[PDB]
């Protein structure tokens, strides 16, 4: 349960990279 | 796709919305699982957006 909560609730590297280079 | 932004009761008036990604003018915003309270003795609407005040 803690691992699933971590996976759902934490920013993944691809998303953060794409948004960071999107602005 | 089926469970994206699914709104389920967590406990009491607190409801849990699952994770999901929205597109705003081509910009992608990802939201984690979150909780929000309803309004007692009323039919409330849970949505995503921006208000005139905010």
């Amino acid at each position: 349960v803690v691992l699933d909560a971590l996976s759902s609730g934490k920013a993944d590297l691809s998303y953060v990279n794409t948004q960071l280079n999107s602005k | 796709w089926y469970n994206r932004f699914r709104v389920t009761v967590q406990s009491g008036l607190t409801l849990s919305v699952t994770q999901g990604s929205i597109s705003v003018s081509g910009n992608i915003i990802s939201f984690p699982p979150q909780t929000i309270n309803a309004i007692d003795n009323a039919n409330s609407f849970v949505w995503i957006g921006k208000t005139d005040a905010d």
Partner: protein, 54 residues
Amino acid sequence: PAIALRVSQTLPNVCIPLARVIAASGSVTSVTDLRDVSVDILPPSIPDAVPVGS
């Protein structure tokens, strides 16, 4: 005014979003699906020509 597949630098308020492509040095760095299969699109706000009560 012909309808076809186009690539621009800005999403029109009236369009069918397919993808956002970030490319650099002639090579694509990232592609993001803008379809309903991946994201829930916040609809554009298009005001009417005549204000209410006019």
